[PDB]
Design a protein around this ligand. Structure first.
Ligand SMILES: N[C@@H](Cc1c[nH]c[nH+]1)C(=O)O
Length: 502
């Protein structure tokens, strides 16, 4: 009986071990709920979904702000064997319409901030045809008020589908199961220093895979979620103090802003131990200033396809291994697949993952699914290097890969050669559109133009790189666009140089 492997039943079990432990605290909306209350609201959510015709395998799209309803809808769907489709509320109406059609969502639950997108979608001549119900905030709240908190007969779990999350032309839907979600939650919970009764600040959207995994591992470990649905750097330290927060989810921008507000210098947070951050590596200067406040930083690497698991750079290693994405986590194997097709745990190549945290499939894309795997190893499309001690360094992401005359070219391959040229101080490589090649690799170079010439860089590149990998344009710039935490902004580069191509 797969109920024992059901994420919604897991919540019920946390509500049995620790019924009176705080589960969800959102001071902005005055929500302070125990695990027993959260389980009861999940049951009410399940009752509401049942009432709407949702059965095992049916998709319920979620387009709403962070809230305990978001969590309990997810849990409620889990108990029913339904499949949640959490949608990014920043997407425009055509992208949301695609997702609804592709997922074949039956019910759409939307927040008030998303009413304009839903309105635009429902106004189409032929809206997504599978949607039988569009349920906004007021309707959901009224339904919840009259629902019974009966525990559903839960008879699904394990490898049963649980959610579809879209990742990007058109996105693909990444299908996760009760098993993958549980594995990812276990992976985090067994790898990071998380403790029974820890209080964890979530100030990132719940439609991001890592935030979803955070919600689930919180129930798994008995952690209280402290919710900040709209991040405000001028309000976050107060919240961290008032709610005795132990761990916080963040990204480097957030931690940078949090360092600049008056509260950083002024409030003391003795219970706060570390942030878990996603995104580019944290700058050393930021790691150090947080370390002076006795706060550590955990970093890592994950994808939608890995349910937010993958590698973690533990606190002890943040400075030691600046720029690393860390080591493989519990329940995850991570390696690199060479140009030769050999998978190795040490060296350079395409990052590959083998783990129960992996997606079951891309939704209604069986060939894409097969092509993404090599003997159980998921091919990320990202390139990196694993050092002799097992630390992963990401070199380039799939999103920045260039297809030039049908050949794949990653920018880091070129950047790491050109940065070597004497007189070059910085280099970033992007693809620019091209009638002939589709995209060409353009090197944007900051250099002493008295010492360095375009011809010299290209003829120098011709020394280390196959001919098809040579930059087809070299562009000298006085500056490359970077964010305050020092990440090269390739999206800005592409915008800047759109004026140079037809
Ligand atoms: N080994 C089970 C454990 C589990 C899943 N969900 C809740 N518990 C699985 O991952 O499928």
């Amino acid at each position: 009986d797969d109920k024992m492997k059901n994420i919604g039943w897991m919540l019920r079990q946390r509500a049995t071990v620790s019924p009176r432990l705080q589960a969800y605290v959102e001071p902005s909306t005055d929500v302070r709920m125990t695990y027993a209350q959260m389980n009861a609201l999940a049951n009410r959510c399940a009752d509401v979904l049942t009432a709407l015709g949702i059965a095992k395998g049916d998709r319920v799209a979620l387009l709403m702000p962070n809230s305990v309803e978001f969590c309990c809808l997810f849990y409620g769907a889990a108990k029913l064997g339904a499949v949640a489709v959490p949608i990014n509320t920043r997407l425009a109406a055509p992208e949301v319409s695609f997702i609804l059609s592709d997922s074949g969502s039956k019910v759409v639950i939307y927040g008030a901030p998303s009413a304009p997108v839903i309105d635009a979608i429902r106004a189409q001549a032929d809206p997504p045809g599978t949607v039988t119900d569009w349920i906004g905030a007021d309707s959901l709240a009224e339904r919840l008020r009259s629902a019974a908190a009966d525990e559903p007969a839960v008879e699904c779990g394990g490898d049963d589908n649980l959610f579809i999350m879209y990742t990007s032309g058109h996105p693909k839907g990444v299908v996760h199961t009760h098993e993958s979600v549980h594995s990812a939650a276990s992976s985090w919970a067994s790898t990071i220093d998380v403790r029974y009764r820890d209080r964890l600040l979530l100030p990132l959207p719940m439609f991001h895979v890592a935030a979803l995994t955070t919600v689930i591992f919180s129930a798994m470990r008995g952690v209280t979620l402290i919710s900040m649905p709209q991040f405000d750097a001028t309000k976050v330290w107060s919240l961290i103090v008032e709610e005795r927060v132990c761990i916080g989810g963040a990204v480097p921008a957030i931690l940078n802003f949090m360092r600049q507000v008056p509260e950083f210098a002024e409030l003391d947070a003795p219970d706060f131990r570390y942030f878990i951050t996603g995104g580019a590596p944290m700058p050393e200067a930021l790691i150090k200033i947080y370390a002076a406040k006795n706060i550590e930083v955990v970093q890592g690497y994950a994808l939608t396809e890995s349910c937010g698991g993958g590698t973690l750079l533990l606190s002890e290693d943040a400075l030691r291994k600046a720029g690393s994405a860390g080591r493989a986590t519990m329940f995850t194997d991570v390696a690199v697949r060479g140009d030769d097709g050999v998978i190795r745990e040490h060296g350079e190549g395409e990052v590959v993952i083998k783990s129960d945290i992996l997606l079951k499939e891309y939704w209604n894309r069986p060939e894409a699914t097969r092509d993404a795997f090599d003997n159980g190893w998921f091919r990320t499309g990202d390139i990196g290097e694993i050092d002799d001690e097992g630390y992963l360094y990401i070199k380039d992401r799939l999103k920045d890969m260039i297809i030039s005359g049908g050949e794949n070219v990653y920018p880091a391959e070129i950047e790491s050669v050109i940065i070597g040229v004497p007189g070059v101080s910085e280099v970033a490589v992007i693809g620019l559109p091209d009638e002939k090649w589709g995209e060409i690799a353009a090197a944007i170079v900051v250099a002493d133009q008295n010492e360095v010439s375009e011809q010299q860089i290209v003829e120098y590149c011709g020394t280390r790189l196959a001919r098809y990998k040579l930059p087809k344009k070299v562009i000298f710039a006085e500056a490359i666009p970077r964010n305050p935490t020092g990440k090269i902004l390739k999206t800005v580069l592409r915008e800047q140089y759109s004026a140079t191509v037809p």
